[model samples]
Target: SMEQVAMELRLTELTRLLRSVLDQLQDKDPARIFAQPVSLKEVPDYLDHIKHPMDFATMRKRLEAQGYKNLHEFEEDFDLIIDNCMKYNARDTVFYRAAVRLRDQGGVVLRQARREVDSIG
Candidate 1:
């Protein structure tokens, strides 16, 4: 029973931390480009360039499904979303710049969460 309770608590903490991270990203993304999946009509060649496309909406779904076992898994997806943007768009383009900004700002939020989670364990 104690083990089950401990696992539940861990899951709850992780979900809260991930939701906070997602909220920050959603807020930072003024254009809402990262909010959902990239449309094929808008960028037909998108899937060709990005082998693994990720988005905030997808992340939220995965989070709700408890697909991530650890914070690193969540961060990986977060990085993937930014990485895909940088790869798909040129450095001078708005998408690339937005991804860079998110990488910098979101990174700070992630690191802070990491410290807090680590401190608890």
Candidate 2:
């Protein structure tokens, strides 16, 4: 078993994992926060269109326009991470792997999520 820490810098990343775990999943871009003039679905397609990679802001804006919201919630299990870090389990490995993934992905996805609630607000 593993407990995930909800760091503020990775709000979107953390929230995405939580929402997935909680099964309280919401649309990625329901509120059209992107300020787009085309079909929001096109945003993802646009991502596919791009080979160099763009920012999540492009997608988040579209989602915001679709009417989505998040409560910004989290809970902790102090022993979870500590225990795994010391014990060497799958959870720890997965968490570490995810941490690396987040780091490699530029973590801009997280910042974009934050912008959805804040930058646009």
Candidate 3:
């Protein structure tokens, strides 16, 4: 009996949460890619100014190493970052993580698609 209603409610809530996050990402425009100059010195100040829920190492590597302007591929860049970042993140304390992760540019967020999807049969 609980499963009947609770599962539906949980799914609905998840859908809503995902939808809300999507809406903000759509509004604030998180999927940005840009080509810009980056330097080690710039990073000292650069890391200080970003907001949370945004991963820092991912931003740092993208800027410090030179990257393509295409959106970071999920299986390639995004998921890869998650793997590496978690390790790097765990190695560093919270303060160190934030102090050294930043981009030379905020990035080209407004002109990309969040994901591509096709309904399954």
Best lDDT among the predictions, by candidate number? 1
Clashing pairs in 1: none
Write the residue-wise lDDT of candidate 1 on 41-91 in tens digits.
988988778889899999999998877878899989999999999888899
Q: Compared with the true structure, what per-residue lDDT tens digits does model 2 show for residues 8-112? A: 334554445444432221123233221232233654553343333322343344233421234332212212222322333254565345324433342344445
RMSD of each: 1.4, 17.4, 15.0
What are the TM-scores, per candidate, against the unseen true structure? 0.90, 0.24, 0.25
Worst 10 residues of 3 by lDDT: 102-111
Cα lDDT listed for each candidate: 0.87, 0.34, 0.34
**Runs of candidate 3 exceeding 4 Å displacement:** 30-121
Expressed as tens digits, the lDDT of each residue in 1-121 for candidate 3 is: 9887876665454444334433433333233211122233745543343222234334445433333233343224333323333443444564324222311111222122333211110
User: Residue 19's C-alpha lDDT in candidate 3?
Assistant: 40
What global local distance difference test value does model 1 have? 0.87
